[PDB]
């Protein structure tokens, strides 16, 4: 029988019991590691049979990639060394 905050006796009179307790663990992030998603596959052993499909893929990707690239550049242009003050 554990005890504490929660009043097991009076709760049991209205049909409530505790059926398990556990400690509480949260996740912390530390360190770093770089992962690069290489969007252009190596196709040389396919001897240009996929040129049209690759070019269209590359064109579709630009529409998605350019706005993110712009946002990243927009931020770091506001990140200066200390002594500009």
């Amino acid at each position: 029988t554990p005890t504490g905050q929660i009043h097991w006796g009076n709760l049991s009179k209205i049909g409530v019991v505790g059926i398990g307790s556990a400690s509480y663990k949260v996740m912390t992030r530390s360190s770093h590691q770089s992962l690069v998603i290489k969007l252009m596959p190596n196709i040389t052993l396919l001897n240009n049979c996929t040129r049209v499909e690759i070019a269209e893929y590359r064109r579709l990707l630009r529409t998605v990639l350019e706005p993110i690239r712009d946002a990243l550049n927009a931020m770091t242009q506001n990140i200066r060394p200390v002594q500009s003050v």
């Binding site: 504490g4 905050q5 929660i6 009043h7 006796g9 009076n10 709760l11 009179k13 209205i14 049909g15 409530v16 019991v17 505790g18 059926i19 398990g20 307790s21 556990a22 400690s23 509480y24 663990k25 949260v26 912390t28 992030r29 530390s30 770093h32 590691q33 770089s34 992962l35 690069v36 998603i37 290489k38 969007l39 252009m40 596959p41 190596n42 196709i43 052993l45 396919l46 001897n47 049979c49 996929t50 049209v52 499909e53 893929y57 579709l60 990707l61 630009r62 998605v64 990639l65 706005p67 993110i68 690239r69 946002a71 990243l72 931020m75 506001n78 990140i79 060394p81 200390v82 500009s84």
Partner: protein, 367 residues
Amino acid sequence: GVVLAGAALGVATAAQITAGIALHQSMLNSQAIDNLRASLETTNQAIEAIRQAGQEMILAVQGVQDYINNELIPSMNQLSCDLIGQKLGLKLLRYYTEILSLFGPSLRDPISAEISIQALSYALGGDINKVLEKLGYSGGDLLGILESRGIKARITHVDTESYFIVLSIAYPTLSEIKGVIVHRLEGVSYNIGSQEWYTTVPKYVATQGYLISNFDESSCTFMPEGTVCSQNALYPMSPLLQECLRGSTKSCARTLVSGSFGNRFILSQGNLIANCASILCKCYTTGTIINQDPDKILTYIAADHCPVVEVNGVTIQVGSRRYPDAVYLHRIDLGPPISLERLDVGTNLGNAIAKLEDAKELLESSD
């Protein structure tokens, strides 16, 4: 040391400020990019640790290379040139669709986003186990499995010249938080007449010194030695509901079994708590039925009175008494009946405010 230009940027959340500084600190150097760009150009694997002595390893992942290497190249001298391009063309569009889903406009602020490793599954070729193994995760125990799946990534560079995305990952480790116990609550129904009620309490609550808190189990998984959460799970609880859990039965609300209900008994502390008005309870040792006093709502069954009880057809041996004999309903203060459906809450609240706006105009007349 770097400084954020706050007047220029004008407005930013703490999350955006902190990710921006982290972006400056974690992005690859201008010439690490040209080196990375050249290393990517010459590789031909689905997954590859790019090791340049001096700099740290960079893990490169190509989402359709396994398909090219395993399915298309061995077919090079059996299939036509259109067909090879058509086969790959279907794969590339399916891959583009996933990039669009993940990095496209539905990604609200890409700069400060933290993308789970699982959300990257398709972008990384449809599976993450070999990626994790290269990072040092074996899959050998369930805690390490849970930690690995808590990895989150931030975007640090998008290259429109060679089409690649650099992400920075961090490794989760487990932080047991000192005072906090998560408790799982469970109710059984009780009878007033032929009406079956049960008291409405949350599925999980947390105790934290003197405080009782609500607990959102959405982001948690319940290992045998602790609850592991990827998110803050703790949230405030109203004083009224805390008083309910502290023993004030009048403070706990209750609702009907309007439908079917499978909780008319429970095994607890080696005893049976049972609504023996709603199911057949029977002492197996003696063969005699256990009737529930009609002015009682539950029965607390222990070995002082029945060492082995049969309950809705299930036979259970019980231990010595750990819950007192049921008291009369008139010695129990029940709290309000409520309904939890959200439209009922709004309808009853709307009525209550209207009566309460009324009440201030009579309390002008009498004062």
